[PDB]
Amino acid sequence: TVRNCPFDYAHELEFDPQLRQLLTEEPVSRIRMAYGEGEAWLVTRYEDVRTVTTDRRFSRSAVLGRDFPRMTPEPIVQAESINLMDPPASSRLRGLVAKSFTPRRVEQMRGGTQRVVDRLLDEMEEEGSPADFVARVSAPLPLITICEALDIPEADRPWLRAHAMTMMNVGAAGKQDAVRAKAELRGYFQELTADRRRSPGEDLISTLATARDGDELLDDDELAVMAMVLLITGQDTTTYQLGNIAYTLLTRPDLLRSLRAEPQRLPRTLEELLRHIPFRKGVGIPRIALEDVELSGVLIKAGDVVHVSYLTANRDSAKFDRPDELDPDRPTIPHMTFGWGAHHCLGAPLATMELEVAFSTLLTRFPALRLDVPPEDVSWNTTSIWRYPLALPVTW
Numbered sequence: 001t002v003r004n005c006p007f008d009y010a011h012e013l014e015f016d017p018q019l020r021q022l023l024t025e026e027p028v029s030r031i032r033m034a035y036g037e038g039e040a041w042l043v044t045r046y047e048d049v050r051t052v053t054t055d056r057r058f059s060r061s062a063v064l065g066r067d068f069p070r071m072t073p074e075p076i077v078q079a080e081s082i083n084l085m086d087p088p089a090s091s092r093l094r095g096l097v098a099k100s101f102t103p104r105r106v107e108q109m110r111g112g113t114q115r116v117v118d119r120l121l122d123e124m125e126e127e128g129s130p131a132d133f134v135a136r137v138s139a140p141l142p143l144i145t146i147c148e149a150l151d152i153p154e155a156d157r158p159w160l161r162a163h164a165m166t167m168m169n170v171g172a173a174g175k176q177d178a179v180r181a182k183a184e185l186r187g188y189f190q191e192l193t194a195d196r197r198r199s200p201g202e203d204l205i206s207t208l209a210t211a212r213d214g215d216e217l218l219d220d221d222e223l224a225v226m227a228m229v230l231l232i233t234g235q236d237t238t239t240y241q242l243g244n245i246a247y248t249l250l251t252r253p254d255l256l257r258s259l260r261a262e263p264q265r266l267p268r269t270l271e272e273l274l275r276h277i278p279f280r281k282g283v284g285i286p287r288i289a290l291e292d293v294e295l296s297g298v299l300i301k302a303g304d305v306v307h308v309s310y311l312t313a314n315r316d317s318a319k320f321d322r323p324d325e326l327d328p329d330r331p332t333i334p335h336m337t338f339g340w341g342a343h344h345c346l347g348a349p350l351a352t353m354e355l356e357v358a359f360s361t362l363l364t365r366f367p368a369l370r371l372d373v374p375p376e377d378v379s380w381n382t383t384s385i386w387r388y389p390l391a392l393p394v395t396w
């Protein structure tokens with residue numbers, strides 16, 4: 001009755017078979033995952049999952065305090081984080097960083113992102129073919145950008161990601177690691193944010209720390225946590241989707257030619273890769289059903305833990321015809337790669353912009369770009385809630 005879900009599948013970017021089976025055959029299923037007390041529902045259908053993310057009957061505020069079935073021994077979340085608030089209390093702090101990424105603002109920052117990318121490739125060319133696209137592009141760019149954004153000193157950055165990542169370990173014994181790593185992170189911002197509030201720079205932490213509706217909207221905890229949360233998120237998913245997309249383009253010659261034939265297809269192609277590419281293992285933060293809510297003919301009692309799978313949502317044949325096929329031409333329908341509902345991804349805008357400025361430069365600069373080894377020789381991360389390539393040797 002209750003499925004085992006270690007969610008350990010890692011083979012290339014192949015869609016987790018357990019997930020494909022639960023989509024087609026038990027689109028609402030009882031499950032139990034690596035760590036946490038109790039069990040939880042798993043909703044896998046587009047429309048059903050859309051329901052769960054938006055319908056005020058399901059709270060993420062209600063998760064505060066539960067040993068919720070999750071994939072990391074220590075939960076990645078914190079108390080005062082945007083992740084454990086719903087609208088309305090979310091909408092005020094979301095509201096504030098959302099100013100920072102209006103298309104005017106993000107289509108300004110482009111300028112600098114173009115100069116970062118250019119320099120990163122002006123360096124990879126200098127060290128000469130072959131090279132690691134992960135080391136020389138996919139890893140640095142997202143980290144530079146979010147640090148530039150937050151005015152993070154150059155010396156702290158390699159440190160800060162090697163803590164960000166440590167919190168994303170699914171490893172039983174890397175839990176003390178995680179709780180210390182997390183608290184050291186909290187602390188560093190606790191201070192460096194209280195150092196902006198104090199002598200506001202003209203960066204983004206300053207934008208958060210200085211905004212005042214009469215009396216500063218953000219409390220110090222509320223801020224330090226928001227500056228800490230913006231750093232973590234600004235440098236995992238994006239670094240990974242830069243490797244994932246690269247791999248996919250260098251292993252689907254038809255796709256990669258089509259783009260080289262008509263580069264204008266790129267913003268449409270990226271959406272379709274985004275949809276497809278299963279850019280994580282398992283399921284992230286759940287929600288609690290606040291009241292009984294039947295959902296695909298299955299009552300969910302009040303106080304039950306609900307997970308949604310964004311990855312099965314994207315591959316729902318009810319929404320996308322030939323869903324497993326990767327058609328950048330297909331009738332555009334909103335993907336759920338960037339989340340949905342209240343907690344939809346806050347940095348969608350900026351990762352959009354990084355992915356556009358990256359692959360559009362790559363494509364022109366290195367038309368000849370090819371994977372330098374066979375695809376099955378590429379090693380895929382196993383230790384993370386995310387899926388990404390460890391290295392991506394390329395020629396040009």
Ligand code: HEM
Pocket residue numbers: 082083090229230233234235237238241279284285310336337338339340342343344345346347348350351
């Ligand atoms: C390809 C790039 C990215 C992907 C695929 C991605 C994906 C996601 C996803 C799937 C969620 C799901 C939250 C949920 O539904 O429960 C999320 C939340 C979030 N992402 Fe991202 N993200 C990306 C880039 C970024 C960037 C650059 C930032 C930069 C600040 C960012 C900040 C956030 C934040 C703050 C949340 C939490 C919002 C909330 O729960 O209220 N993301 N992201």
